[PDB]
Design a protein around this ligand. Sequence first.
Ligand SMILES: [Zn+2]
Lengths: 147, 91, 124, 136, 71, 119, 74, 75, 195
Amino acid sequence: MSTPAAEQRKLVEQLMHDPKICKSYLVGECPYDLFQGTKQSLGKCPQMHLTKHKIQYEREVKQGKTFPEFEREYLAILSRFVNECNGQISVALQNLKHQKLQVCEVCGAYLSRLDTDRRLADHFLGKIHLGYVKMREDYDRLMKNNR
Amino acid sequence: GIPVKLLNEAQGHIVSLELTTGATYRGKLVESEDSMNVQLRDVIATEPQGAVTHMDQIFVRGSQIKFIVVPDLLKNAPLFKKNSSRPMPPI
Amino acid sequence: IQVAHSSRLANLIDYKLRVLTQDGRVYIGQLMAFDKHMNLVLNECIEERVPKTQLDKLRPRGTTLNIKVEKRVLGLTILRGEQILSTVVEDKPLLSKKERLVRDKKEKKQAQKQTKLRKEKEKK
Amino acid sequence: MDKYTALIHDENFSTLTLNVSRYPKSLAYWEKLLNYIVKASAPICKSTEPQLLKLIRCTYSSMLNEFPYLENYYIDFALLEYKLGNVSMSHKIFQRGLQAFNQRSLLLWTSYLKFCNNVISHQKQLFKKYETAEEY
Amino acid sequence: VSTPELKKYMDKKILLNINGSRKVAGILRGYDIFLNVVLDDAMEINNNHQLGLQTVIRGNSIISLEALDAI
Amino acid sequence: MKLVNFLKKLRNEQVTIELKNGTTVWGTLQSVSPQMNAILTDVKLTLPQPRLNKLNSNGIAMASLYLTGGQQPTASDNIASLQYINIRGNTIRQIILPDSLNLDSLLVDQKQLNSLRRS
Amino acid sequence: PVNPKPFLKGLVNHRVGVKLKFNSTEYRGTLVSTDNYFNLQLNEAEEFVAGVSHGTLGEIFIRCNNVLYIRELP
Amino acid sequence: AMVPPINCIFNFLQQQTPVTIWLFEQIGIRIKGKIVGFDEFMNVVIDEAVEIPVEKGTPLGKILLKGDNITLITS
Amino acid sequence: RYYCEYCHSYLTHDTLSVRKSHLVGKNHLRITADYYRNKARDIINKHNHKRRHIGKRGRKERENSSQNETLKVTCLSNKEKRHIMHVKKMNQKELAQTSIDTLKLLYDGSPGYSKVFVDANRFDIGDLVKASKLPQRANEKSAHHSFKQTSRSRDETCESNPFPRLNNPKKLEPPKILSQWSNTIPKTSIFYSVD
RNA sequence: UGGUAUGUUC
RNA sequence: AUACUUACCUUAAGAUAUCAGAGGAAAGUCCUACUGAUCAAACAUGCGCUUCCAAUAGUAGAAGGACGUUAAGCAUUUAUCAUUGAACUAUAAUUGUUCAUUGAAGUCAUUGAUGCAAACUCCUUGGUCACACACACAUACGGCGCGGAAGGCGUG
Ligand SMILES: [Zn+2]
C-alpha cells in the first residue's frame, strides 16, 4: 500500500481467547482466507486474524497443552464447504451426464481427457484446487483422528 | 517511466552493470523489477581492484547500481516513439 | 553552442548531453529519455574519467593544461538518478528544428492512419 | 557422514581406484574412475565438499600427466575450474594444455580463444593472443 | 510496495557482501520488502568466525546476494 | 509552508549556489523544480582553494570541473564558465541570495494566506 | 514490553542523554518534546564531545537523522 | 515455512535471547543487550545495554537505538 | 494500465502475474520477434544519401579530363535489376547463416568428446541448456515429430568404438567452391580414383 | 460487466 | 476466426494560471462566450540585433574522432604469505642473506603498467552559394547580395 514504510507498519502493528479471535485461522488455514483471492470468494473474514495468536498457538501446541474443542470448532467450519461443494460436484456430474469432458471433484470443475499432462498440471496448481486440497485432506485427517 | 521500462525490455539479453562499490557484472538479465533489482545469470564479475570471477547467478539490490548497459538494438524499441496513438481502451 | 534560456530537460531530447556523477566521471551521449528520479538514458554515451596520476596537473599553479583522460565506450546505457550531479549540453541535435517539425508531422499522419486501419479491421 | 565419506566408503571407489593403480596406461580405467567421481557429486557448485573437489582436481591432473595429448580433457578440466569460479586456474589449465602440444594445436587454441573473449576485457592483449595463435 | 523475487533462494546457502567489505554466508530463511534477510548458521568469511544461531541483516547494507548452491 | 515555493519566485536573479562538493555556482537563475532542481544559465562554476598552503581541496570536484568541459585552458584556478548548467536538487547545500530583494514581500505564502482568509 | 514511541513519550520532561553518530558527541539534558520523526528538543543541556564536558547549552533542537541512541540517565 | 525478519526480531524479544548488534562501520562499536521492543522502522530498545569497541566497554542501561544505523542483529 | 506497443493492445490493471503471463504469451512473442526482425532489416537496407557538396572544378583539372575519354556506363534494365537484387540479397543472407563446423566432425570419436562438444554436458553451459528447453506444454508437437532424440551421455569411455575405421566413418566432404567460378577448376584430376 | 493468458474442437 | 475449459487480475486521491475589481446563486463557497493586470503556450511577424556557414587563381584547409600505425618508441617502476630444516653474517630469541620442504590464497598482462612527446595514415562533418581580383580606415573600418543554423529581444 503506497510507500514501503507504511506497508510494514501494518505488519508490525499486526504482530504487536476466542471472543475477538477466529479459530479457523488459528487451527490451520482459515477457509475464508484460502479462496478470497479468486472469484469464488464469499468475502472478507469477519472475525479478526493475527500473527501473534498464531505464535502463541504454536507455543501452546509445542508445550503440549492442546485443547481439542478448538478443533471441533474448526471441523464445524469445514463441514459446510465440504457438503456444499459435494452437492455442487454432484450437480457437475449431473450436467456432465445430461469433445470429451470429465469432471474433477478435487477442483470441483471441468477438465478434458484430451488435454496433455502439463496443461492439466497447470490447472492442478491453482488457488481453488490447492485451497480445496488443503481443505479436504485436513477434513479427512480430522475425521480419522476422531474415529 | 521509460528508463525502468527499458530495463524490462532487456530481459534475456546480456547486460553489463556497474555497482556503486565499483564492481562490474556482465551476464544475462533474468529478472528485473520496478525497484531496479536485477538478477544476472552466468555472470562474469569484475571486482573493483580488478579480479574477474564467474558466478552462476547474482541478485543485486537496485539501489546500488550506477549504470546498466543494455543491447544496442533497443534504441529502436517502441517506447521511444513520440507520436503514437492508442486503440481507445476498453471497459 | 548557445542553448535556449527556457529549455528544460524535456526540451533537450536528442541533444548531446554531458552528465556528471558523484565519483568524478562524465558521461557523454545523445539523450533519449528521463524520469521523475532524473535517471537518463543515453544513446552513445562514452564515459570519461581523470586518472589519479593525471589529476595533480589540475591543481592551481605552460599556458594550457593537457589532461589525458581515461575513456571507456558503452552504448545505450541507463544511468541512475541518485548518482547524477549536474548536466551540461555539448552538441545540438542532428536534425534542424524545422526538419524535426517536418518529421513529427509525418509521423503523426502515419500513426493516425495505422490506428484507423486497425479499428476498421477489427470491425470486419 | 558427508557425501565425501559416502564416496570414500563406497565399494566401487576401491575397485576403480585400484584398477587404475594396477594398470596405469590403459585409460578406460582412468575414465571410469573419473566419471564415477564426478557423477557422485550430484550438483557441482561453489559449496560442494572441498575434500571432494580436491579429489577431482587430483584425478584429472594425474590423467593429464599420463596422457598429455588428450585435448578434450584439457578443455574439460578448464571448464570445470571455470564453473567453480576461478578463471585464473582455468587460464593456467589452457596454457598447460597448449604447452603439451608445443603450442601447435587447433582445438586448444580455438577453445582458449572462445574462452578468452569473455574474460580478457583488454583489447590490445586479446588481439595479441590471436596474433600468437595465428603463427602457430 | 513489491516484495523481492527471492522465492527461489529459500533454504539454500548464500554469500552476500554487507556494506562493502564484510561477506556473510548463511542459509536464507526469510526476506522482507526492504530486502532484510534472516539466515541461520551465518559465518563471516575472512579463520572465519561464526555469528550466531539466527541473524537478521538490514537490507540497506546489502549490495549483492549471489547463491552458492543449486538454485 | 514549503520554502521551495519561495525559491521558485526568484526566477531571474543572480544567485550563488554552494553545493555539497565545495563547488560554487554563480549565475542567473531560471526555473526551480518542486525538488529544488535549479537551472541556471550564464554560470561560472568555481572551486575555492582553502587559503592554507598544505591543504589540498576536494579532488573529485576538481575532476568534476575539468570534465564539465568549460575550464579555461590557460586558467590558474579551477573555474569553468559554461552556458546552461542544470543541477539536481539534493546537491545544493546553501543558496546565497542577492542583497537587494525584499524578503517581506516574497515570503508571503499566497496559499497559506488564502486558507487563513477563507477560514 | 515497551516499544520505541511509548519509550520516548515516557521520557518526556525526564533527564536523557542523546549521542550523535559522529564524534561520540553527547548532549545530556531534559527532554521537552519529540516529533514523529523523533526530532528531539532538549532543555538545560550539556555537551560532551568525549568524556570531556565543554559547556552548557540552553535549548537545542537535535535533528532526527544524526542521533545514534537516546538513553535514560541516572 | 518462512520466517520474516519481523518474526525473528519478535522472537528475540519474546525469549529475551541476548543479541549482539553490529552497527555499521566507521563508528566502530557494537551493542550487546536484550531486545525489549522494536519498531516498524527497526528502531529497537535495549535493556542492560553494553557498548563494545572494535569486551571491556561501558554499560548504558536501557537505550533507544535508531534503526538507520543497525547492520546486523545476531544472537 | 498496461499497453503493449508491440501487440498494440490494452489490458486491465497490471499485476506482476498478469503482465508476466502476457510477456511470455505466444501471440505476443511472434509479434515481438517480427518487430525486431523488421527494425534490423531497416537498419541494414536503409538506402539514403549523404549530401553532396560539389566544388567548381579548376581549369587545370578540366584539361586532363578532356584528354582521357568518356568511359562507357553499364546499366541494367528494370526486370534485370529486379532479378539481380533478389539474387544478391539471397546471397548475403545465406552467407550470413554459413558457419564453419568442420572441427566438430573431425573429433567425433575422441575419448573426451561428449564433455566438450555435445554442449549439453559442458560445465559452463550445461545447466543453461537444461533451463533453456521450454515449458513444452503442447506435447502434440512432440508426438508429431516421431524421431528418436538420441542423447549422448557424459559417461562414455573409449572402450566403445575401439576400432573407429571398421566401416563406421565416411570420407571428409570435398571443399566447396564458388558456383560463379566453377569453370575455373582443372578439368581432369591427376590420378584415376575409382568410385 | 470486463482483460490478458492457456489448450481442445470444427 | 467461433465456442468451451481453466489460471491470473479487475484501481492512491485531488486539480487545470494568478492577483484585483463589478454581478448572480455579516462570513466564507461557487459561477460569470464578465471586466483589468500579470504569467505561460502555440502561431504569425519583425528588428542596420549576436555568433557560425571550406582551395579551385587551386592538389589545400577547419572542426571532431580513431575502441589507428610507427611501437618491445624514450624515461622510471612493479611480480606473494605462513611453517620446518641447513649454511651464514651478528649487539640478537637467531633481525639480515641463500637453498630445499608443507600449507594457504593467486584477473590477465612484464612485448604489460605508468610518465612524456612527436611524425604518419585514415574516417565523419560543411553554401565547398552569387557578384567580385578591388587601396581601406579614428566616431577605426558602408554589418547596403540571397539563403541557411543557433540563440537574444519586441509586436500581433
Ligand atoms: Zn504485448
